[PDB]
A paper describes a structure:
Lnt performs the last crucial step of lipoprotein maturation in Gram-Negative bacteria by N-acylating the terminal cysteine of incoming apolipoproteins to form the final mature lipoprotein. In the case of Lnt, the nitrilase domain catalyzes the attachment of a fatty acid derived from a phospholipid to the alpha-amino group of the N-terminal cysteine of the apolipoprotein creating the final mature lipoprotein. In the second step, with Lnt now in its thioester-acyl intermediate state, the alpha-amino group at the N-terminus of the incoming apolipoprotein attacks the thioester linkage to transfer the acyl chain to produce the final mature lipoprotein.
Construct 1 (Lnt-C1) contains a fifteen-amino acid C-terminal tail that contains the His8-tag used for purification. It crystallized in space group P212121 using the vapor-diffusion method and contains two molecules in the asymmetric unit. In one of those molecules (chain B) clear electron density can be seen extending off the active site C387 side chain that is not seen in the other molecule, even at lower map contour levels. We interpret this extra density as the thioester acyl-intermediate based on mass spectrometry analysis on purified Lnt that identified a palmitoyl modification at position C387. Although mass spectrometry identified a C20-palmitoyl; we could only confidently build half of the lipid tail into electron density where the membrane region is expected to be. One of the striking features of chain B of the Lnt-C1 structure is the position of the long 345–365 arm that is at an upward 60° angle to the membrane. The positioning of this arm in chain B is made possible by an adjacent chain A protomer that makes crystal contacts with F357 and F358 that pin the arm in this upward position. As aptly named by Lu et al. this arm could be acting as a protective lid to the otherwise highly open active site when in this upward position sheltering this reactive intermediate state from the surrounding environment and deacylation. Although likely due to crystal lattice contacts, the two molecules are arranged within the asymmetric unit in such a way that might give insights into one possible mode of apolipoprotein docking to Lnt. The C-terminus of chain B is in close proximity to the essential W237 at the entry of the substrate portal of chain A (zoomed box Fig. 5A).
Numbering used by the authors: 8 to 351, 363 to 506
The structure:
């Protein structure tokens, strides 16, 4: 048991946690990876244990974030070998937080007691992962709470959020890392009863369906090549693609959805098309919701370029100044704007709170692409009278990789936390309809030009996570943190 070998063990145990997420959905690999990280940091100095946490997260992020390489294969045009260093530094920067959790736990709790692994680690894991999702803009990717979307602890999610499952998974795997090292038989069962108490919670229908307001919703997946997506011209076909695919559905569907940045043009430059399209949807009796880029003039006669969603048709008449839209708030850290003080067009940030959308008597809370993984921001924009959850994205990058599935698995948790049907539309990613409990009602394969049409029923409940948020976990994190820190 030297310092050299424990680095390679955490490197592989970190890669074990990758299997916990989609498409693998091996949720025990989360507990196994949590046990491998929590046990390898026993009776060590902080500076040598931080190397284990740095090598553990580097195995986790090095296996679950490697799909960002093909993201640069389309944007940027780099020679190749430089993109690989970015993934390492991206994993290194994210591993600094994993190493920050391993170093602090070794300074205050060098003793291998149940207090460290069942009280301190679940609370410190909350503050560590939160800082990794707060510094700069935030990147809370690969949280083992999302692995329980198809697992046992899914009943605990609508009560205290996805981050609270990270708390209990660390709390269970902590007592599981105890009984595996100390060979004691008590915390093994104490881990299970704390793991078994949230199991009877996955049969509680917090919501209530409204079968009368059942509608037929259609969502279009145009499958536009990313190499020709933003190309000048060619968009005459893209509009002809959607319209020839949307027109036969305008008469009978009550709501039609197009993905993010579907119309590759400024909103002001395609006005004669939308005024003609809106007037046709009203005759048929349907509502259309699509995403488009907006270069809007501010009061200072300067343009703020936004990533926007607009509404058309019956129940939502079109207008360039209409309040029935949604601007992107949480921007991509480097795909749109620059976060640093200075360098060495930029997208503008929208409001943090926006009223839900409207379309033929339907209330929809929106979230563009990356914004769906922010459970607290989705909860804040959420309103009681909301009929469905809505999310549109463009996963053209990360092609043929495991990226979109990890992204897709996190979006299902938002429907479970809020008990609302989640409608998701993408360019070539996982386009599906998710029920109020993370169940996949319908889904179509990737890399295809198809249209998804199904029936949905709204809900009108209020989950404990919708009333409260992640603060009940912070209280449990505070009490677990305030009590365990004082002892040292
Ligand atoms: C053939 C279907 C199975 C594909 C298997 C991919 C490997 C299994 C998953 C390992 C983790 C993700 O693995 C990732 O997969 C992508 C996508 O194919 C591959 O990526 C590589 O091939 C793809 C084409 O598919 C290129 O566009 C990309 O620039 C290149 O890096 C690499 O292998 C790895 O970056």
């Amino acid at each position: 048991e030297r310092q050299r070998i424990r680095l390679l063990l955490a490197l592989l145990f970190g890669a074990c946690g990758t299997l916990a997420f989609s498409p693998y959905d091996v949720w025990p690999a989360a507990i196994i990876s949590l046990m491998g990280l929590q046990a390898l940091t026993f009776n060590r100095r902080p500076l040598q244990s931080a190397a284990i946490g740095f090598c553990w997260g580097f195995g986790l992020f090095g296996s679950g974030i490697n799909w960002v390489y093909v993201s640069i294969a389309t944007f940027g045009g780099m020679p190749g070998p430089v993109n690989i260093f970015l993934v390492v530094l991206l994993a290194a920067y994210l591993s600094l937080y994993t190493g920050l959790f391993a170093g602090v736990l070794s300074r205050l709790w060098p003793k291998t007691t149940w207090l460290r692994v069942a009280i301190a680690a679940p609370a410190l894991w909350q503050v560590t992962e939160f800082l990794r999702g707060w510094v700069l803009t935030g990147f809370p990717w690969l949280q083992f709470g999302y692995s329980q979307i198809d697992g046992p602890l899914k009943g605990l999610a609508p009560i205290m959020g996805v981050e609270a499952i990270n708390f209990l998974l660390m709390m269970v795997s902590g007592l599981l890392a105890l009984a595996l090292v100390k060979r004691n038989w008590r915390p093994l069962v104490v881990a299970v009863v704390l793991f078994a108490l949230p199991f009877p919670l996955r049969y509680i229908q917090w919501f209530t369906p409204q079968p009368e307001k059942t509608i037929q919703v259609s969502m279009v997946q145009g499958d536009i090549p990313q190499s020709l997506k933003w190309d000048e011209g060619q968009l005459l076909n893209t509009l002809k693609i959607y319209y020839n695919a949307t027109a036969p559905l305008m008469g009978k569907s009550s709501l039609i959805i197009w993905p993010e940045s579907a119309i590759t043009d400024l909103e002001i430059n395609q006005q004669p098309f939308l005024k003609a399209l809106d007037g046709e949807l009203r005759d048929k009796g349907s509502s259309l919701v699509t995403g488009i880029v907006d270069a809007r003039l501010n009061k200072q006669n300067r343009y703020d370029t936004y990533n926007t969603i607009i509404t058309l048709g019956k129940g939502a008449p079109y207008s360039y100044e209409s309040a029935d839209r949604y601007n992107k708030n949480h921007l991509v850290p480097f795909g749109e704007f620059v976060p640093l003080e200075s360098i060495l067009s930029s997208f503008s940030r929208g409001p943090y709170i926006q009223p839900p959308l409207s379309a033929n008597g339907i209330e929809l809370t929106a979230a563009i692409c990356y914004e769906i993984i922010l459970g607290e921001q989705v909860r804040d924009n959420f309103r009681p009278d909301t009929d469905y959850l809505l999310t549109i994205s463009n996963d053209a990058w990360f092609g043929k990789s495991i990226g979109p599935w990890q992204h897709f698995q996190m979006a299902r948790m938002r429907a479970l936390e809020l008990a609302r049907p989640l409608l998701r539309s993408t360019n070539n990613g996982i386009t599906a309809v998710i029920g109020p409990q993370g169940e996949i009602q319908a889904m179509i394969p990737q890399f295809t030009r198809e249209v998804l049409t199904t029936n949905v029923t709204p809900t009108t409940g209020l989950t404990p996570y919708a009333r409260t948020g992640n603060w009940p976990l912070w209280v449990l994190t505070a009490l677990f943190g305030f009590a365990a820190v004082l002892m040292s």
